[PDB]
Design an enzyme around this catalytic site. Sequence first.
Site, short mmCIF file in Angstrom:
data_model
loop_
_atom_site.label_atom_id
_atom_site.label_comp_id
_atom_site.label_asym_id
_atom_site.label_seq_id
_atom_site.Cartn_x
_atom_site.Cartn_y
_atom_site.Cartn_z
N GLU A 11 86.23 92.41 -98.23
CA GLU A 11 86.78 93.13 -97.09
C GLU A 11 88.23 93.47 -97.19
O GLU A 11 88.68 94.31 -96.46
CB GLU A 11 86.60 92.28 -95.82
CG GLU A 11 85.13 92.02 -95.58
CD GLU A 11 84.36 93.17 -94.98
OE1 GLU A 11 85.08 94.22 -94.70
OE2 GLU A 11 83.19 93.09 -94.72
N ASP A 20 87.38 101.50 -90.75
CA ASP A 20 86.49 100.98 -91.77
C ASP A 20 85.74 102.11 -92.49
O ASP A 20 85.95 103.29 -92.24
CB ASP A 20 85.61 99.83 -91.27
CG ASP A 20 84.38 100.20 -90.46
OD1 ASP A 20 84.23 101.45 -90.24
OD2 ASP A 20 83.60 99.39 -90.05
#
Length: 162
Positions: A11, A20
């Site tokens: 991540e 994202d």
Amino acid sequence: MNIFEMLRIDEGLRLKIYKDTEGYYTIGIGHLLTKSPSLNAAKSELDKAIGRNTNGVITKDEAEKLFNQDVDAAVRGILRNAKLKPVYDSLDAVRRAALINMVFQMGETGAAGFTNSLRMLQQKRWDEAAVNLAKSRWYNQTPNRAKRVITTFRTGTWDAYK
Ligand SMILES: [Cl-]
Ligand SMILES: [Cl-]
């Protein structure tokens, strides 16, 4: 290697609000803020999560705190899910981390949706599960990350992360 280090690799770490892969407002170590298109809505969710007026920026310690909470929640979500728990219980330590990773990324509902793969994992049919896991939007949208998780399930080792 462990779940924390694995997810930190997958991540990344960002201290300012960002978007994202799906275009959603996120911060820290993959902590989804909101699916709403509004930055203000994002800033609001952020402040509520941190307990202070952040102005869209947090510190490393705050990021890590969200991260610890998120990992705990994933695990807990797995243990409360009737479809997920049994698989998790049947797996070895390394593969458990792979399942946590999927839950963290896509949520319990999403992971639980991999009905066929789950059954194969539970049966310890590694290669077959790996093939099945790949026939998904998940794999097509974030192929590099998906490949890493899949290899982990397949081999039961951390090789893809070294
Ligand atoms: Cl929160
Ligand atoms: Cl990717």
